[PDB]
């Protein structure tokens, strides 16, 4: 009776109509039987990657033994799993666990063939004694079978430290299934989840889940990553009745709450947002028609599901003269995709001027000084895979950064020294530059081609060239700066009353056509903010009472 | 005797009969026995490529010992295979000390064998190794031998470097037919005679990461492995070789043999599947590139130095991509450098390199460091006519010898490339004044060394339709996510031809133009409404634009 | 509290087994809340007898960690990582901060009489 308490039965649990249907994956049951039906070195082990199904092999073996559909020396056998977490528990009087497990092995010696030991997670018998060298002569006597299941790397990190153990082993690889086998497994599981949650499932919503979850998340393998969307959709549909069945809408809505990619359905509020977007983006960047239209179209294409899912959504570069809005525009698209000016990754490659700075955006090699930390660009996108990424002043980076930036493009995934891959399949890479500033389009593109790698341009999208500026354009910029200076004065509730001759006098002054729009910002505060700031701390500008501005030959009085 | 349950032995097992056939390689054994009987230095290391059979060399040495052919001064030695997985801290040296103590408890013939010792070499062995009570036969790899043993050395002056090398084809055939009578046991078939040499010959070409002794073991043993399914025909065949090598490399089984006439007579209308237009140009190139494969000219010149000039936007570089992917079997094996900056004396040195100590050195040459690796490339030269006359001496010995010197001092070989020297002058003169301008622009000697000066032309107004057909073919493949089709209409397909020529660039607006109107209007359609899956998408012309 | 005086060969694992028994004999009720579950990785010298309880849907286990302490311990342990979800909680805005701060005002007026 030495194992009646420390190990509950397993085949009798399957006989009482309990475990999962296991229809599919017939081959390696027959292969493990072909390994097992030998005279010596039976002792197999199921080894693969975590999640592709190793419970299901033993459950299917149990189902075939209960059904009696087995060959000759497998009929009416009883597989028994032993737990090494209740056997070790009460043992303190200097010898108890030793002779306890010895008596368990002695009772395993009693039956021949009918007993089959399946030790789950068999790297607990290497340690957890004070073990190993008490069952080790007992293995190669044909008494116990020792079927197990481990992870791929844990077998070669803990188990294979002793060579004299692998004589008592034989590896059995188990690969990940296909998409069609996932369709078959989902049709085979489509009875247990409708009884537990009393709702019915359309086969369209059954086929869309594994189809749609393959462009997205790749860290879990695919016998079960399609089960989770269906079960969460069943739970959400049970929530909504507290439209009575599931649909392909619900899979898309759950996966766009999960890992948080907003590539969901067409909710009707954002339809007028995406259509009327050139003016909504034109609320802060006034000017630059042909660039705003191109960026708007590259955003609009990826929402409709047209472009190839083997690239980023928009990976493009725009440049030109100085002070035009090339850094202003990237702050404007994230101000309505996110309504957050700080959810984007803005790194500056004007600091990577050496060959050994690449490690600060990819992470250190394992175990030197900072393998605890991790990278900077890599670890911030892996958590939320939707952020727009700037790259400011791509000139001054050493051209070994570009060797790492290359396989970001044209594949999607980026490796790191941690040992992983992070896939940038729907981010927006925006590259900025200030090359040349001495040609119209011939000389500056000649300098761009003289600065990069030759195919690095063809992998990009439309390389855009900006305009200059114009005296007609400059009035509304003054309107924006006056509105900003008014909204800055809204805490202490001051406001201004700006006359139209003053509003155009701000447009006559400050038109140096090589410095862009940035001298006007300085000129306004040289005119207005200094005089007001001198008056405000001298009394007489008590709050609420507004001030008008008036023209006086080169200043403007208040 | 107490370590044999923790270690192994291939001396007592050497009298079982578990040893392989020792066919071939009966000189390296003499080299090892010559190293082994000396006063110092008697610890050889076998240095070579992995997967060749250094283990088989040591097994053949033990098989020679158990019958006896070495002299009596090395009579009846015992050889131990070491368990290199038995320690992988706390074990990487702990069991190692007991093993070395049991070697110390010999005073005898317990000659060791450690495989891949460059991962195990720090200096705990050296006072015990240089004392002279053990003989350390080892096998390593060439590249890590320049990494581990030369900085962490401490005893590197106590080894001999026996080079094992790659086998020939016939020696591989002899070993492979020696290892033919083993596989009546795990698999059972009637072994075909010619399938052995067929599998070795077909594995010789395309497999690269594996090496010729067991590269012919990734064969036939695998060929009978998937033939286990037919007993769920008892002879293997060349198709049994072909369906393994074809369905592993993802390449269609068209060129299963004959790499000198097949796909040498295929240099034909399959160019027309990629190059629309320029019939006589395709004919002239197809003639000229197979004159070099007969072996009549000198062996050290470029395979084809032919060069052509005419308009832009024709196919002039579309022909270039069309022969890289066919003749070199690589999509990205072209090098397009532009000589549009080379007007000065300080600009030529960018395409060869700097001396060791100057400005551009780590990047190397602009030309040569992209030819040193992958020397199976087609090479273009855009816009030669603005180049300063100090390129043509560098460019001359390119097409006069098959050698050139780089910024370092190494040598590059141009004897298996293709040079193409393009330009854009001409295109208004038919044949006479264009060749006159060629003779006036260059020296007359520069044209005698070159091949044909074949002449391009414009495009037909009806033949320009099929380019737009191929662009619409590339269009519809992307929107298979919505599973749509697009029915194009031939009036609009005529309409895109006039507004997609612009006789200053050739025929280049089209990659932008097929995107712009069509894709943006249909993207607004799909995001708004009124179109679903399965839609044929009819297109037409509304007076000026192309409505839907 | 589990590791306190458990200085014998088997006391921690029998305490944990008693806790798992008093969770298992209930039907579906008790929802365990384990805050800072990077501590659940080691604590043995054991601590591995949670995988059969987790991979049967029998334990419920709501628990919160930080960001980097997740990848320092749990991403290092890629077999445990499958039997969990991830609910990414992000920072609120400034307007939602203002909406929060009108709710917590009564407690700060009670504790300090202002």
């Amino acid at each position: 009776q030495a194992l009646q308490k420390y190990s509950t039965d397993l085949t009798a649990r399957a006989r009482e109509g309990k475990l999962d249907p296991v229809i599919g994956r017939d081959n390696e049951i027959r292969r493990v039987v072909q390994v097992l039906s030998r005279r010596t070195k039976n002792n197999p082990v199921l080894i693969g990657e975590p999640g592709v199904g190793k419970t299901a092999i033993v459950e299917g073996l149990a189902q075939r033994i209960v059904a009696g559909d087995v060959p000759e020396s497998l009929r009416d056998k009883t597989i028994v799993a032993l737990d090494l977490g209740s056997m070790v528990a009460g043992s303190k009087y200097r010898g108890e666990f030793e002779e306890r497990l010895k008596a368990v092995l002695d009772d395993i010696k009693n039956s021949a063939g009918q007993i089959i030991t399946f030790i789950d997670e068999l790297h607990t018998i290497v340690g957890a004694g004070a073990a190993g060298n008490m069952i080790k002569p007992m293995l190669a006597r044909g008494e116990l079978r020792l079927v197990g299941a481990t992870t791929l790397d844990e077998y070669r990190k803990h188990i294979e430290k002793d060579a004299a153990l692998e004589r008592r082993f034989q590896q059995v690889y188990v690969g990940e299934p296909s998409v069609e086998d996932t369709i078959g497994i989902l049709r085979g599981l489509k009875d247990r989840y409708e009884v537990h949650h009393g709702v019915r499932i359309t086969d369209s919503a059954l086929v869309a889940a594994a189809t749609l979850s393959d462009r997205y998340i790749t860290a879990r393998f695919l016998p079960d990553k399609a089960i989770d969307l269906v079960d969460e959709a069943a739970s959400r549909l049970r929530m909504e009745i507290d439209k009575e069945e599931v649909g392909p809408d619900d899979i898309a809505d759950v996966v766009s709450a999960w890992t948080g990619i907003p590539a969901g359905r067409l909710l009707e509020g954002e339809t007028a947002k995406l259509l009327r977007m050139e003016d909504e983006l034109g609320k802060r960047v006034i000017g630059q028609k042909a660039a705003v239209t191109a960026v708007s179209d590259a955003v609009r294409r990826s929402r409709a599901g047209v472009s190839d899912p083997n690239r980023p959504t928009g990976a493009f570069m725009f440049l030109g003269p100085t002070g035009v809005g090339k850094t202003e525009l990237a702050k404007a698209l994230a101000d309505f995709l996110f309504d957050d000016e700080r959810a984007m990754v803005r790194i500056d490659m004007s600091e990577y001027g050496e060959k050994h700075t690449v490690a600060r955006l990819i992470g250190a090699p394992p175990g030197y000084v900072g393998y605890e930390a991790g990278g900077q660009l890599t670890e911030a996108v892996r958590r939320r895979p939707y952020t727009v990424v700037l790259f400011d002043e791509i000139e001054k980076a050493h051209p070994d950064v570009f060797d790492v930036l290359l396989q970001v493009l044209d594949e999607g995934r980026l490796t790191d020294g941690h040992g992983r891959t992070v896939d940038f399949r729907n981010t927006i890479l925006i590259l900025t530059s200030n090359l040349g500033s001495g040609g119209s389009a011939e000389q500056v593109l000649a300098a761009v081609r003289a600065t990069f790698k030759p195919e690095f341009i063809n992998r990009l999208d439309d390389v855009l060239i900006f305009e200059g500026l114009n005296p007609e354009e400059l009035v509304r910029i003054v309107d924006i700066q006056l509105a900003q200076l008014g909204k800055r004065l809204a805490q202490r509730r001051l406001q201004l009353q700006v006359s139209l001759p003053a509003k155009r006098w701000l447009a006559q002054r400050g038109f140096d056509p090589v410095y862009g729009a940035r001298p006007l910002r300085r000129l306004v505060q040289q005119a207005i903010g200094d005089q007001l700031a001198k008056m405000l701390l001298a009394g007489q500008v008590h709050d609420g009472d507004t001030v008008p501005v008036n023209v006086s030959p080169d200043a403007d009085s208040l | 005797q107490a370590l044999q349950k923790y270690s192994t032995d291939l001396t007592a097992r050497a009298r079982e009969g578990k040893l392989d056939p020792v066919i071939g390689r009966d000189n390296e054994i003499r080299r090892v026995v010559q190293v082994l009987s000396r006063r110092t230095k008697n610890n050889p290391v076998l240095i070579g490529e992995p997967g060749v059979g250094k283990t088989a060399i040591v097994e053949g040495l033990a098989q020679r010992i158990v019958a006896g052919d070495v002299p009596e001064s090395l009579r009846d030695k015992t050889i131990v295979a070491l368990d290199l997985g038995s320690m992988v801290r706390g074990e990487f040296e702990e069991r190692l000390k007991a093993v070395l103590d049991d070697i110390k408890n010999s005073a005898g013939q317990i000659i060791t064998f450690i495989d891949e010792l460059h991962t195990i070499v720090g200096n705990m062995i050296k006072p015990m190794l240089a004392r002279g009570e053990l003989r350390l036969v080892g096998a390593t790899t060439l590249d890590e031998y320049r990494k581990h043993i030369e900085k962490d050395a401490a005893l590197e002056r106590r080894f001999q470097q026996v080079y094992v090398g790659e086998p020939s084809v016939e020696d591989t055939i002899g070993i492979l037919r020696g290892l033919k009578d083993r596989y009546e046991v795990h698999h059972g078939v009637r072994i075909t005679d010619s399938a052995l040499v067929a599998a070795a010959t077909l594995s010789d070409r395309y497999i690269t990461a594996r090496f010729l002794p067991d590269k012919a073991i990734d064969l036939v043993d695998e060929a009978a492995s998937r033939l286990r399914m037919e007993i769920d025909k008892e002879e293997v065949g060349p198709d049994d070789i072909a369906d393994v090598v074809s369905a592993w490399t993802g390449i269609p089984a068209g060129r299963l043999l004959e790499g000198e006439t097949a796909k040498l007579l295929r240099m034909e209308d399959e160019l027309g599947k990629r190059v629309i237009g320029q019939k006589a140009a395709v004919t002239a190139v197809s003639d000229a590139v197979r004159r070099s494969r007969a072996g009549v000219s000198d062996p050290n010149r470029p395979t084809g130095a032919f060069m052509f000039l005419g308009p832009t936007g024709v196919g002039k570089t579309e022909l270039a991509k069309a022969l890289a992917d066919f003749l070199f079997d690589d999509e990205r094996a072209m090098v397009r450098i532009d000589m549009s900056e080379y007007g000065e004396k300080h600009t030529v040195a960018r395409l060869i390199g700097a001396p060791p100590g100057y400005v551009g050195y780590e990047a190397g040459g602009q030309l040569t460091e992209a030819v040193r690796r992958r020397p199976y490339t087609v090479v273009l030269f855009d816009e030669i006519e603005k180049a300063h006359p100090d390129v043509f001496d560098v460019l001359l010995q390119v097409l006069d010898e098959g050698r050139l010197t780089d910024g370092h001092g190494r040598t590059v070989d141009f004897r298996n490339t293709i040079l193409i020297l393009t330009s854009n002058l001409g295109s208004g003169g038919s044949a006479e004044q264009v060749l006159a301008a060629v003779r006036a622009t260059f020296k007359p000697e520069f044209i005698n060394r070159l091949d044909d000066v074949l002449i391009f032309e414009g495009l037909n107004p009806e033949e320009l339709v099929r380019i737009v057909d191929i662009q619409l073919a590339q269009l519809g493949k992307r929107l298979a996510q919505r599973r749509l089709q697009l029915q194009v209409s031939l009036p609009a397909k005529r309409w895109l031809a006039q507004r997609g020529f612009d006789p200053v660039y050739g025929a280049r607006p089209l990659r932008r133009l097929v995107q712009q109107a069509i894709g943006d209007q249909l993207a607004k359609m799909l995001l708004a409404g009124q179109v679903h899956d399965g839609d044929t998408v009819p297109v037409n012309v509304s007076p000026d634009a192309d409505s839907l | 509290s589990m590791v306190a005086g458990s200085k014998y060969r088997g006391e921690f694992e029998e305490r944990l087994k008693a806790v798992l028994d008093d969770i298992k004999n209930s039907a579906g009720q008790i929802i365990t809340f384990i805050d800072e579950l990077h501590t659940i990785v080691g604590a043995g010298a054991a601590g591995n007898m949670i995988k059969p309880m987790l991979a049967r849907g029998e334990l419920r286990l709501v628990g919160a960690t930080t960001l980097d302490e997740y990848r320092k311990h749990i991403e290092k342990d890629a077999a445990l990582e499958r039997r969990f979800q991830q609910v990414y909680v992000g920072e609120p805005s400034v307007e939602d901060t203002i909406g929060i701060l009108r709710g917590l005002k009564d407690r700060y007026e009670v504790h300090h009489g202002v």
């Binding site: 050496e354 030197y368 000084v369 393998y371 | 100590g357 | 014998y8």
Partner: peptide, 26 residues
């Protein structure tokens, strides 16, 4: 009857260093 008596450990992790390789600018 038998106590466990947990033990300590010591972990090592070194650091690389780079050379800068000046260029004579001609």
């Amino acid at each position: 009857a038998a106590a466990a008596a947990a033990a300590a450990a010591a972990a090592a992790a070194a650091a690389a260093a780079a050379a800068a390789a000046a260029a004579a600018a001609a």
